[PDB]
Design a protein around this ligand. Structure first.
Ligand code: CYN
Length: 153
């Protein structure tokens, strides 16, 4: 799905998330939780967070934000050759956590907003282009393993 010009544009932008990995996932997650309250109920450790301040105050959210981007960060450094790190997440999020594919759509959009907000001006038409594609290739590979186990379709 993507070339190196494009991969190279994805990793430069990732370069940005890594200087503040915990600030970028707290915000990503906040943005998911307030945008789609429904997703917050899946978590028995953050279901208690009614407000956005109880959320931003939360030291447990930021520790969960890190895991999220550390695990995502690693798939993308693979440049679509993620068959290995991905199998386990698809199979965890599907049989165990039972998260439908569109919640993965919510997070992706969520990531792309967050990148705008925090870098208001240094994430362009092309980077934005290439970051969408990779998050798309990502969802698609999972959809493919989500279809094998027959989790909703
Ligand atoms: C996982 N979030």
């Amino acid at each position: 799905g993507l070339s190196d010009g494009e991969w190279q544009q994805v990793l430069n932008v990732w370069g940005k998330v890594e200087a503040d990995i915990a600030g970028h996932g707290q915000e990503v997650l906040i943005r998911l939780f307030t945008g789609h309250p429904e997703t917050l109920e899946k978590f028995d450790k953050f279901k208690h967070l009614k407000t956005e301040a109880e959320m931003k105050a939360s030291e447990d959210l930021k520790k969960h934000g890190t895991v999220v981007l550390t695990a995502l960060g690693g798939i993308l450094k693979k440049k679509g050759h993620h068959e290995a790190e991905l199998k386990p997440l698809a199979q965890s999020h599907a049989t165990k956590h039972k998260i439908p594919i569109k919640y993965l759509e919510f997070i992706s959009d969520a990531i792309i907003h967050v990148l705008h907000s925090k870098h208001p001006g240094d994430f362009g038409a092309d980077a934005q282009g290439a970051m969408t594609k990779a998050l798309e290739l990502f969802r698609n590979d999972i959809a493919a393993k989500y279809k094998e186990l027959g989790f909703q379709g």
